[PDB]
């Protein structure tokens, strides 16, 4: 209700505030990597990241206005996406690599220990270099996260749409503040939102051979990761 009257700037501060930190991984650089150990570290990483995410979500303006079921659904649809945007962002300053954790920065040929990974690796790296060349901003980054959350599932169908129009407003505000022409603001808004398509696609691919990387049981995946994974497919 009261989320709709948040000004552009109360929403920017509101999101930067709710930002999860960057986690370390159960990582022993002694043991080389296999399919098993490589899945060990990421599901451990993402397991923990999931818990911050759930809490992040609730500080997403207007999110707690949705009935329990709605909130479940969105997180069930966007979790991997959000993981992947976050990962692409902290991987920005490291070309050719992927900063899973500060202690786990991976390059391309290490996605080979797991089949189907390397391909998603290339897509992520690609997005990372799109973020770089576009010079995405922290304040822009958290808005996209908000969009992903609220758009992955998408009176009750209106509320979220209003919030979505608020985040657009906000994104626009930031490009305005940066000193962009009306023609640059609209072009960048388009370039931002089309990256989301790609993120969606990355999320769908990972879900595929992570539903089969569950059958081909190379690693235990927590009860939550399974829960998230089974209601997606």
């Amino acid at each position: 209700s009261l989320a709709l009257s948040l000004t552009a700037d109360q929403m920017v501060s509101a999101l930067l505030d709710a930002e999860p930190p960057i986690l370390y991984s159960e990582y022993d650089p002694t043991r080389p990597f296999s399919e098993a150990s490589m899945m060990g570290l990421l599901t451990n990483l993402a397991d923990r990241e999931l818990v911050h995410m759930i809490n992040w979500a609730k500080r997403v303006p207007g999110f707690v206005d949705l009935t329990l079921h709605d909130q479940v659904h969105l997180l069930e649809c966007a979790w991997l996406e959000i993981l992947m945007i976050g990962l692409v962002w902290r991987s920005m300053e490291h070309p050719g690599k992927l900063l899973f954790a500060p202690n786990l920065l991976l390059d391309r040929n290490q996605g080979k220990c797991v089949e189907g990974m390397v391909e998603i690796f290339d897509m992520l790296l690609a997005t990372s270099s799109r973020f770089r060349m576009m010079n995405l901003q922290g304040e822009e980054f958290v808005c996209l996260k908000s969009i992903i959350l609220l758009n992955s599932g998408v009176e009750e169908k209106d509320h979220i749409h209003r919030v979505l129009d608020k985040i657009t407003d906000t994104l626009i505000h930031l490009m305005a503040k940066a000193g962009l022409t009306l023609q640059q603001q609209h072009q960048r808004l388009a370039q931002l939102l089309l990256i989301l398509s790609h993120i969606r696609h990355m999320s769908n691919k990972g879900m595929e051979h992570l539903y089969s990387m569950k059958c081909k049981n190379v690693v235990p995946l927590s009860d939550l990761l399974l829960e998230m994974l089974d209601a997606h497919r």
Binding site: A57, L68, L75, L224, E227
Partner: peptide, 10 residues
Amino acid sequence: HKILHRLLQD
């Protein structure tokens, strides 16, 4: 009642 269900109410 679902892992993700209770973690949103905690």
